Amino acid sequence: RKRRRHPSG
Amino acid sequence: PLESQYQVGPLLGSGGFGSVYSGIRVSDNLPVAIKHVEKDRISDWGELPNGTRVPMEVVLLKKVSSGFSGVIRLLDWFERPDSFVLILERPEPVQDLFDFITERGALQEELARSFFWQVLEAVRHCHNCGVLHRDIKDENILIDLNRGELKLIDFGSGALLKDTVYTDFDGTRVYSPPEWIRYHRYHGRSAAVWSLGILLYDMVCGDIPFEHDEEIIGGQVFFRQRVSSECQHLIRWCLALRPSDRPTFEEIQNHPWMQDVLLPQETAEIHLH
Numbered sequence A: 001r002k003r004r005r006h007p008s009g
Numbered sequence B: 001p002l003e004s005q006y007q008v009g010p011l012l013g014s015g016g017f018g019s020v021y022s023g024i025r026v027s028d029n030l031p032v033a034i035k036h037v038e039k040d041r042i043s044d045w046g047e048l049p050n051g052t053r054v055p056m057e058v059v060l061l062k063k064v065s066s067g068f069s070g071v072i073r074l075l076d077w078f079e080r081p082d083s084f085v086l087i088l089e090r091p092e093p094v095q096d097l098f099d100f101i102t103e104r105g106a107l108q109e110e111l112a113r114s115f116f117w118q119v120l121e122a123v124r125h126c127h128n129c130g131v132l133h134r135d136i137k138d139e140n141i142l143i144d145l146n147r148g149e150l151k152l153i154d155f156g157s158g159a160l161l162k163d164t165v166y167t168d169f170d171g172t173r174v175y176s177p178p179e180w181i182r183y184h185r186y187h188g189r190s191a192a193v194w195s196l197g198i199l200l201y202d203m204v205c206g207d208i209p210f211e212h213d214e215e216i217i218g219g220q221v222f223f224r225q226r227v228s229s230e231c232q233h234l235i236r237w238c239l240a241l242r243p244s245d246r247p248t249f250e251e252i253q254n255h256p257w258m259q260d261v262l263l264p265q266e267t268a269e270i271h272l273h
Ligand SMILES: Nc1ccc(-c2ccnn2-c2ccc(C(=O)O)cc2)cc1
Pocket: B012, B013, B014, B017, B020, B033, B035, B072, B088, B089, B090, B091, B094, B096, B139, B142, B153, B154, B155
C-alpha cells in the first residue's frame, strides 16, 4: 500500500 | 549581519516550510537550522511588541521559545528585502517521524506510547503559551535519535489559541477533523485532538487511516495491524465525529493505554540505539 506525504494547504 | 554570524551548510530540505539549510553559529559552533521564507508566500502576518510586522510564524515561535525541548526553539530571525530568515536550533542526529515510520513500519506500542506522550506534552506547552499548531503530523515531528526526544516543528500554519470558532485552515487535510471537511468550522483544542488520533493510528498501524474526505467524515476506523484493545479505544475516542465527544489532553494522558510511559533516555536506548 502506497504511503505518501501530504503537503500543507 | 547574517552572513558573518552563521556558516551556511548544505540544504536540509524544502517545501511548504520554505527552504531549510544546515548551519553552525560561528560564536559557539552550535548546530542551527536556517529557514528562509519568501514574503510573497506568507499568508498570516503578525506584529511584535515593537510594532514590526513579522510573519505569524515568528510570533508563535517566540511565544513557545521557553526552552522546553518538546518544541523547536527559535534562536534569532532577520528580515530581507523579499524574505524572512529564521534561525532555529538543530538537534543531531535527527530523522522526522514520517521517514522513521516509513522505514520501521508500524511501531511497537511501547515506542508509540513514548512518542505520543511527548507529542502530548509538546502540544500542551503550545496551548499553555497561547499557540495552536494546526498541523500536527508525523512530517512535523523530529526525533532526536540519541536523546530519544521529539520536537514539534513548522509553525507556519499555526495561529493564536482562541476559544471561539476557527473558519480558516492551512494545515494538512488528511489530518483535519470532519467538522472542517463538512462545515469549514472547528475549535482549536478538539481539532488538535482529532489530528492526534490520526497521528496515533499512524504510529501503531504504519500509515494514516484516512486518505479521502468520505473516510474522514465516515466515522469508521479499520485497524490494518494488530493493535491492543486499550490503544484502539483511545484512538477511536480521539476520532469521535462529534468534537465534544473527543477527550481532553488530561483524559488522553489518564487513559489506561498511556500509563507507565518510558523516559526519553530509556526510549533511545531500547528502541533507537
Ligand atoms: N522535511 C524536513 C527537512 C528538514 C528538517 C530539519 C532538519 C533540521 N532542522 N529541520 C527543521 C526544518 C524545519 C523546521 C520548521 O519549519 O520549524 C524546523 C526544523 C525537518 C523536516
